Write a protein that binds this ligand. Sequence first.
Ligand code: CU
Ligand code: CU
Ligand code: CU
Ligand code: CU
Lengths: 659, 650
Amino acid sequence: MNYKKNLLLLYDRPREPIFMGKGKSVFDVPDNYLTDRYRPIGPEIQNRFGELAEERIPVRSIALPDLRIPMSLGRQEQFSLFIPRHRKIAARLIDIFMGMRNIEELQSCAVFARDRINPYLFNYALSVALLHRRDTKNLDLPSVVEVFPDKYVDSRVFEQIREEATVVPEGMRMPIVIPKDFTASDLDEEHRLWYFREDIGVNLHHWHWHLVYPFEASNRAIVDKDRRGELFYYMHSQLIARYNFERFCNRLQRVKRLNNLREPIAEGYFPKLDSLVASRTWPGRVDNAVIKDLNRELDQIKQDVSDLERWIDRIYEAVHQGYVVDESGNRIFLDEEKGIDILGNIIESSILSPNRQLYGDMHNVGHVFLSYTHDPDHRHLESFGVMGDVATAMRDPVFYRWHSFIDDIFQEHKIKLPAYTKSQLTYEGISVTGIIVQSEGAPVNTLHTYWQQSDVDLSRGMDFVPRGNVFARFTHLQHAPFQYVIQIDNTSDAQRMGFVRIFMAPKNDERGQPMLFRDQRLFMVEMDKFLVALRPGANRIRRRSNESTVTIPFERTFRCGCGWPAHMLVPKGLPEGFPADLFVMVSNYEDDRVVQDLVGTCNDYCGVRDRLYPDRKAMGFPFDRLARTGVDRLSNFVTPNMAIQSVNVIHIDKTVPRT
Amino acid sequence: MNYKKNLLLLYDRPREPIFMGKGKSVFDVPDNYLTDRYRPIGPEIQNRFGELAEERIPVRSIALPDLRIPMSLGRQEQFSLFIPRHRKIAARLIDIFMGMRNIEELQSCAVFARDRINPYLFNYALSVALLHRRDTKNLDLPSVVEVFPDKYVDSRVFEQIREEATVVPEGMRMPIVIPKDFTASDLDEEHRLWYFREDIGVNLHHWHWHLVYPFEASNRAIVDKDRRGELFYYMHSQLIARYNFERFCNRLQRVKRLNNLREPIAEGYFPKLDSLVASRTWPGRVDNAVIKDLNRELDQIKQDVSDLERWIDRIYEAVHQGYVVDESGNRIFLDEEKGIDILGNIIESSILSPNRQLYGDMHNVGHVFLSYTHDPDHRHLESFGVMGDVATAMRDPVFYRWHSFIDDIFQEHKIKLPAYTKSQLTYEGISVTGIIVQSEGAPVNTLHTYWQQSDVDLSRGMDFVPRGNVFARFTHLQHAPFQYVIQIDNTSDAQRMGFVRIFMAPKNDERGQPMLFRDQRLFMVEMDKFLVALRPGANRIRRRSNESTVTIPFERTFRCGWPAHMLVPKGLPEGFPADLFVMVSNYEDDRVVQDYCGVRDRLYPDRKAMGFPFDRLARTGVDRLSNFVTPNMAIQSVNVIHIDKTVPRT
Ligand SMILES: [Cu+2]
Ligand SMILES: [Cu+2]
Ligand SMILES: [Cu+2]
Ligand SMILES: [Cu+2]
């Protein structure tokens, strides 16, 4: 109905009162729906903003549950799901919106609440409700860049956008260029990874992944998704694999983990963001900051570093022991199948953790510690730095160090699992004899990258700015389109089903030696995974880069287990060319199959919002475990149903248009 | 003429282009005066903003000197006079405006430049030109709070002012309350001094003092004001005396100096300001930050901490030696008269310094070091913290530590001067027999303080905001009006002229005994200094608090000296004990013929050293105030009572 489209108007101009009129519509709000500030002059307002509006949306006055808890958080405050207190507030609001039976009462509850609660919080609470109600399905939620550009853009632009919108008439407005490589100069070698850390795309993917797989609320409210623990492990694990790749393409070494929390953090990061909702800026972190015990009475944080250390010590113990203990006292075994999934819920701390109290909230609490080094006891009345918000966490270099450490803990479990036997990863009959890649106007087995400007309308997000269009020009990494061509022989006499699994890693190390398996297995980034039907004899399989099941289209972002930006699919490489091993495996789909019916949807990649995850094999399956005896490098790890290919990744420092 | 009033329109809405129309007027700018962005759509603009304007100001197209250097500083960048490079840019722009023939070209040069150079820089360069130009005298420059509220107000208000101005019609707009005590909670005991550090008044006084008495290379005529070195010493010295007073009224100890620069700085400060011109916020400083060697290639700063330490070591040496050495190699003696004045120019590094190269730029460079602890090599592309701008420097607690240190160095010279002899501070014939104070509805010898909201129109400063009024409500310390009553006997047979010098200090120490002189002399804050004619026999002198020569009225500081509402320390609810002191000196000796306090435009009207009775050590035998006194002086126990209530302005 219309109602579905009318809720989307709530996302429009989050800080402009709801009675000011969104898009080509305006709400006809009751007077008991007006805020205390504006209620005493309600007559003057409804009339004043009624003009220039095509439609007028009525709103029925209903009960509305107690909104004390939702309103506890200040309006000009920041909102993060990592902070214990905010979790209880959001989970309560989510509960209200979720608990409105009708799509009409949801509209009424929303319209009332919207101008009383924290915009960032409202956006989250609504987003979660809409995505996981039955009546509001297939609903295309506006990009959070468009509603909250302050979390994605250098603060400098805002006073330019205000100038441009006030001075120049619509239609003649110049696109505002968004600064790139702006957080640090060349004295900081970390500044080279701007195109990854600070890319709009990857930050959106991270935010959205945490939307669809929360770790707190209600198991029926989306917490208990199939293998979300393993997902949490793998997704984040692939972030670092991809990061480590991009590091090698900028003459840097692999990211060093956060060994121990008492030693200083070498790499500081000033993010250059200004929250228009908090009206403040995000604090920076200085070089050689040290983690400090937190006492944030307001936020309900009373945590010592030793608490974190204690959780880690215990988790390590469990992993080595090979089992965990639940609240009840029973033992649950970290087996080949569900081990990783369990560990994930334990480490992140999802209410699915079999004993939160013992093994703690290790990952999340780490994010808070790292974000509050500048003001840990709240004496300076400062908010958390960028690592304290999922929306912005990936911008900071320390993210990759903390997430690197966490990964090592997971690894400690994976190296206990028994090696995949020759048998287990052979497909009797099937043989892959070669794989190549071809780009238009470029040699075989060669990928190209470059810079590319794209445009985004930030108009809906610019509160109290003269209406009209406000286009911003993002510069971001892009790759030339390509396609894989895979030669597979059947030699069986029957149609064989198979999973095509495509990963890509560096060929050599940082020192220039052909990489060993033990090393290289952890640097393989998934590139595609799709089902294929093979006829007897010979089969030529062709697959486009844009068909990738790891990726989501351009259109979705601007307009894994969840959608990685398409333009970030290929590592940057070097101008002189960066050598890389392309790997493909065809596994026996009959074993890997997960009997299930789905057409799929994602964040709103096929989707996988349907109960189960469509692959019985472990995530990162060929390379998640150690090598079997005798294996030493990729070229002797291979079975017949696998193939390797030398690829060369060439960057070109030029800015192509979008066409 | 009109021209004088037309320049004042440049101060209106600094970031709104000059062709958008200021007040009830608009400028008719040439097309070669437009900016490159807006030039190609000139046809659409001049017409679009021509409407709703009563007057239209024409502007003649002139040659215009090269504006390369002025334009070198980015538009979205911060501007500080402490940074070496900015000094050279501003001094060059000042030079351009200053060099324009008529006030028809001053207006033309200005109108062109305004939208090409950094607003903060423009404001400074213009302010300086107008204040010291030939045709432009007695011109009332708009308060810098009204043009740049971002340097004086929590950033939180800005999005409220934008909301209020867009939603609510004029006339029905609610005044925006400005948050007070907002930079730190009660876990930080320093937060108590918000009413002084963060008070609009005192921050304006500091900014303005540096306007009228620069040290900047600039030109020697502008910088060389009578005894500006001693002024620099005394004014800043009184800031800390007053600060130390306010500390005692908040159950704190005296401010500790910055002993040595290698040790951490305990007190951090996040100022909560957001520069709308830079579109960023000012960085904070964390607890236990350490000073670090600066390498800001862009700003032209290559200074090591050891450089600073070397300057200090040398300055100390000179002070103890008793003389300095000029560039030429000659020796100049730090005598009783001009010693302090010299030292001032040496320490701040004013171009008047007899040897900048040797004794350095000690005070100023310190401000930069302290403001860049968070990003000293520019690797993080961050700007300076609050201590890097005179406009905001007093907000940070470290200001008082750094300025406390500097004062100790001056003191090291003052303790070398010979004690004032009984003779030197006696007035033969004159005897002061008593001084008292009286407030309406309050016992004798009792001062009261409290909080008071006042209103300021920040409308001129709110760029790209719907036109109308935008009143902001400041909460600030205030004192009940009072008056001194002084009983003076002549016993001479002739009319005697005299200077009345009134200071106030704390009465007792940490242990609850009468403070000793050595201690107390440094805590005396000047309260008034005025000329009086005494008839033979007995004289009853009466002086109102609002007549103070240390102070200037409310009206000036909201539209220059020390804010009037800050004249009296806060005191305690239970009452704070204080010694009120008055001295009558022989005006004939003190006279400086001639046809106040810190800022006097003319030569300084007092031959005596600034601080006079207490600048030097005690003569032998003297031990406390009550035996320092001569007949022509008087002491009085005063009690300062605070009341935590908010009175209106009426
Ligand atoms: Cu995450
Ligand atoms: Cu994380
Ligand atoms: Cu100063
Ligand atoms: Cu200073």
